[PDB]
């Protein structure tokens, strides 16, 4: 069952992790912490939402002797993969040089920016050796201004249309002093052919803001397999969606119009009413229970049998049993 406790409608219905709101940097468990560090990163495990802000300062990666905190292992930034919401801001002034993008925040979806850095910024990425932002799932920056600056070899960030992610008027953007626009196109670091003129977070097809044609999975392709293909499919909300295994692959034309085994064009084995099946019902029940048997005629359409023939049948009438 599924019900609501403390403002969240939660149970083990959940796909993936159950939603869990955690505190930001400077409040609560993280009081007096200047940044995400090696001792407090544990307390973000399995968090999906963050009430408040998130700082990743350089202090984090060199350690600190005054507070006896060791430096942070770059590998332990994957703790942040489950986070999908930040009510405050996201400020990054330090990131491992080993790592080329912010793929620890790949599943981040929304920055509410109810509290803003200084007085204006909800997203702040400054002074990193990253080559691409990599915020693939970022769909809304609700209040603050965006500053991405000083990232000497960062590309792609200018392709993004930042007004299509905003939520309030007066919301500006400061993209400044990253890698050169001409230098990015010259090195081949430009949005993939399959992206649309909205931008991208990186080079690969799964990094587009949106797709020019269609999407299969979270990847972003050209054609959906409508007329040809191995697991050919149909298009629903600009998305390739598989076609029920029990519908015969029809050549030259579309093979179905919906997900179910009913709304395809021709069945691959037999038919029971609206649905295409592989086996006519032989011992299915309902209520006022009686086991209903069904025989397939010469044209492989299943019809039910004379009710009194309860131990199976092959022919119609009384003759089968």
């Amino acid at each position, epitope marked *: 069952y599924e019900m609501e406790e403390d403002g969240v409608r939660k149970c083990k219905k959940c796909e993936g992790p159950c939603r869990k709101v955690c505190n930001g940097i400077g409040i609560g468990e993280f009081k007096d912490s200047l940044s995400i560090n090696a001792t407090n990163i544990k307390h973000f495990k399995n968090c999906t939402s963050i009430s408040g802000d998130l700082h990743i300062l350089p202090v984090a990666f060199r350690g600190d002797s005054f507070t006896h905190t060791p430096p942070l292992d770059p590998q332990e930034l994957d703790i942040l993969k489950t986070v999908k919401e930040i009510t405050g801001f996201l400020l990054i002034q330090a990131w491992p040089e080993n790592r080329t993008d912010l793929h620890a925040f790949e599943n981040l979806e929304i920055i509410r920016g109810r509290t803003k850095q200084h007085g204006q910024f909800s997203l702040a990425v400054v002074s990193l050796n990253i080559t691409s932002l990599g915020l693939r799932s970022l769909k809304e920056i609700s209040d603050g201004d965006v500053i991405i600056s000083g990232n000497k070899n960062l590309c792609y960030a200018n392709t993004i249309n930042w007004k299509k992610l905003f939520g309030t008027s007066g919301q500006k953007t400061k993209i400044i002093s990253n890698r050169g626009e001409n230098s990015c196109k010259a090195t081949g670091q430009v949005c993939h052919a399959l992206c649309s003129p909205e931008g991208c977070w990186g080079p690969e097809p799964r990094d587009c803001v949106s797709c020019r044609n269609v999407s299969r999975g979270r990847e972003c392709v050209d054609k959906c397999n409508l007329l040809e293909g191995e697991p050919r499919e149909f298009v629903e909300n600009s998305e390739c969606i598989q076609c029920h295994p029990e519908c015969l692959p029809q050549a030259m034309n579309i093979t179905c119009t919906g997900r179910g085994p*009913d709304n395809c064009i021709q069945c691959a084995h037999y038919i029971d009413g*609206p649905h295409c099946v592989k086996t006519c019902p032989a011992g299915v029940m309902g209520e006022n229970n009686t086991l209903v048997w069904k025989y397939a005629d010469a044209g*492989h359409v299943c019809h039910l049998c004379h009710p009194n023939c309860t131990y199976g049948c092959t022919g119609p009438g009384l003759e089968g049993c």
Partner: nanobody, 118 residues
């Protein structure tokens, strides 16, 4: 080929009841299934209840126990009892003219709006 004319629909209050009816005139074949599909805001269209000439019925799991599909010749009736907000949708009459397992055709009505609401 085949046309379908629908009657019924309307709004009710939660827990109330409605009757839907659809009668089909045309080139109708001997083995065929008739019934209703439905689409709520803003989901996909899904089967609600389809009875066949053979009598055997199919229901969505959401509606079993509350919906009753019945057939006389080439007109079908749907008794919708114990109606819930989730049932608010457009209901499409339907007919699947079945010749063979590789040969059938689908016809749809215009769509009747059912809402439930206080």
């Amino acid at each position: 080929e085949v046309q379908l004319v629908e009657s019924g629909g309307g709004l009710v209050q939660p827990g109330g009841s409605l009757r839907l009816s659809c009668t089909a005139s045309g080139m109708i074949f001997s083995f065929n299934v008739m019934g209703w599909y439905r689409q709520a805001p803003g989901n996909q269209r899904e089967l609600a209840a389809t009875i066949t000439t053979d009598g055997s019925t199919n229901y969505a799991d959401s509606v079993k126990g509350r919906f009753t599909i019945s057939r006389d010749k080439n007109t079908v009736y749907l008794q919708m009892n114990s109606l819930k907000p989730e049932d608010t949708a457009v209901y499409y009459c339907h007919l699947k003219n079945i010749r063979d397992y590789r040969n059938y055709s689908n016809y749809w009505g215009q769509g009747t709006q059912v809402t439930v609401s206080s």
